[PDB]
């Protein structure tokens, strides 16, 4: 996932600000913060505030960019394995001042704010609600970068995740989009992608994967030249990110030969399958049919551009997104062109879509059953 080439003649759309909450919540934000880029004067375009109980792992987290990040610790809350949300609630409150004071300065120019939290835990999970109130009462443009625990995480944990999802989904109107991350999915992906890899490389993989996923789209929307008036530039992007509800990012890279306008069903399926198999969490057609906003950017070389971006294509795409999200306000099928392209990736046609205003995924539903299975069986034994 190297962007050295693009970032050079490219540029970001929004200046994100990640508010870390808990071990995992800070692991991601920190990962997003420690991102060097070839952009114009700003190796580290992202800033973050790591808010978590004083632990040995948090006291371990390494930061590359000094000054763009600030660790905030909470005394007398070395919870640990306890994993009690309410506790994490008091902690954030008892230091509410010492925190916001750091948010009022570290984010004096952040177009958006990603409340990165690891659902299921106790610290982050608990403060996740008090953190939203803070950024809300102080009029900010924030979103929710949450992660869905896996089954092996045991009962208790799952109960915590579910507890907040419900609270969130019912107050989603009070803030931006919710970039849900399915740890179960990513975990199951890392096994396929790298079958030989060891379990000690997971987190790194995911964090570095979630960071690039979020960063890649932010870079694409404002690093290429449009082929027409239909745009999905920084301005439009900012919209999809401020719309309440879950957000699903999709990506698909194909070759010019593979892509056939005469026989679209061939690749359309892939795009339709790649759109269902989100980058961070799986989503079915049913859930997409209730999306408020959509967008699909196509990036390719200057030569394959004029040839590919014909009348038929543009429509075939307009129809694709159409059947996928019939109730979307507007379907900006904005095709872009990249001049500074490598002849190696010359015959490549990349896709980038962003579906917002989506309902809760099927995963959260499963996490409700896995908790039910346990509780029920725990009594079927009595």
Ligand X SMILES: Nc1nc2c(ncn2[C@@H]2O[C@H](COP(=O)(O)OP(=O)(O)O)[C@@H](O)[C@H]2O)c(=O)[nH]1
Q: Give the interface segment with ligand X, choosing from 19-27, 225-233, 299-307, 332-340 (CB under 6 A).
A: 19-27
Beta carbons of 234 and 220 less than 8 angstroms apart? no
Give, in order, the Cα–Cα distances in Å from 31 to each of 24, 44, 196, 212: 10, 11, 24, 9
Each residue 114-133 as x (binds ligand X by CB under 6 A) or -, in order, gives ----x-xxxxxx--------
Q: Is 153 in the site for ligand X (CB under 6 A)?
A: yes
Beta carbons of 247 and 182 less than 8 angstroms apart? no
Q: Can you tell me which residue has the tokens 């079927």?
A: 380
**Rounded distance, CA 199 to CA 373, Å?**
27
Q: Which of 17, 20, 22, 357 is close enough to bind ligand X by CB under 6 A?
A: 22
Closest CB to ligand X among residues 200, 382: 200
Which is nearest to 52 in space by CA: 71, 70, 67?
71
Nearest distance, CB of residue 144 and ligand X, angstroms: 14
Beta carbons of 340 and 9 less than 8 angstroms apart? yes
**Rounded distance, CA 209 to CA 19, Å?**
18
Q: Is 207 in the site for ligand X (CB under 6 A)?
A: yes
Stretch 160-189 residues interacting with ligand X (CB under 6 A): 183
Binding-site residue positions for GTP: 23-24, 122-124, 153, 183, 206-207
Q: Is 24 in the site for ligand X (CB under 6 A)?
A: yes
Integer-rounded Cα radius of gyration of the chain: 21
Q: Which of 6, 19, 23, 217 is close enough to bind ligand X by CB under 6 A?
A: 23
Q: Is 157 in the site for ligand X (CB under 6 A)?
A: yes
**Rounded distance, CA 334 to CA 234, Å?**
12
Q: Give the interface segment with ligand X, choosing from 65-73, 146-154, 231-239, 248-256 (CB under 6 A).
A: 146-154
Estimate to the nearest angstrom the gap between the alpha carbon of 329 and the chain centroid.
22
Closest CB to ligand X among residues 48, 299: 48
Binding-site residue positions: 23-24, 122-124, 153, 183, 206-207
Q: Is 332 in the site for ligand X (CB under 6 A)?
A: no
Name residue 117's beta-bridge partners. 21, 146
Binding site for ligand X (CB under 6 A): 22-25, 27-28, 118, 120-125, 147, 149-150, 153, 157, 183, 203, 206-207
């Amino acid at each position: 996932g190297n962007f050295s080439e693009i970032e050079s003649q490219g540029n970001i759309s929004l200046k994100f600000g990640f508010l870390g909450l808990g071990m995992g919540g800070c692991a991601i934000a920190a990962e997003c913060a420690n991102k060097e880029t070839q952009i114009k004067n700003n190796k580290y375009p992202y800033r973050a505030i790591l808010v978590n109980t004083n632990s040995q792992d948090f006291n371990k987290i390494e930061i590359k960019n000094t000054g763009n990040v600030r660790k905030i610790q909470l005394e007398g809350y070395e919870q640990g394995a306890a994993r009690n949300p309410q506790v994490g609630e008091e902690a954030f409150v008892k230091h509410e001042t010492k925190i916001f004071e750091a948010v009022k300065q570290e984010f004096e120019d952040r177009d958006f704010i990603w409340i990165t939290c690891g659902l299921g835990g106790g610290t982050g999970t608990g403060a996740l609600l008090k953190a939203i109130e803070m950024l809300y009462e102080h009029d900010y443009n924030f979103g929710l970068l949450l992660t869905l625990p896996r089954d092996a995480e045991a009962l208790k944990v799952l109960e915590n995740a579910t507890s907040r999802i419900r609270s969130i989904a019912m107050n989603q109107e009070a803030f931006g989009s919710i970039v849900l991350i399915d740890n179960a999915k990513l975990y199951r992906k890392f096994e396929e992608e790298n079958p030989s890899a060891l379990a000690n490389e997971y987190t790194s993989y995911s964090n570095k994967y979630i960071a690039d996923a979020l960063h890649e789209i932010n870079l694409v929307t404002s690093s290429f030249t449009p082929f027409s008036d239909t745009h999905f530039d920084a301005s439009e992007f900012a919209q999809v990110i401020n719309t309440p509800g879950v957000l699903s990012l999709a990506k698909l890279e194909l070759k010019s030969n593979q892509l056939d306008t005469e026989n679209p069903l061939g690749y359309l399926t892939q795009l339709g399958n790649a759109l269902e198999k989100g980058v961070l969490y799986d989503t079915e057609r049913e859930e997409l049919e209730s999306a408020k906003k959509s967008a699909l950017s196509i990036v390719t070389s200057p030569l394959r551009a004029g040839r590919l971006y014909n009348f038929s294509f543009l429509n075939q795409m307009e129809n694709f997104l159409k059947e996928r999200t019939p109730y979307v306000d507007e379907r900006p099928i904005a095709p872009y062109v990249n001049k500074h392209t490598t002849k190696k990736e010359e015959d490549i046609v990349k896709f980038y879509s962003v579906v917002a205003g989506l309902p809760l995924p099927k995963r959260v539903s499963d996490i409700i059953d896995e908790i039910t299975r346990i509780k029920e069986e725990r009594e079927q034994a009595n």
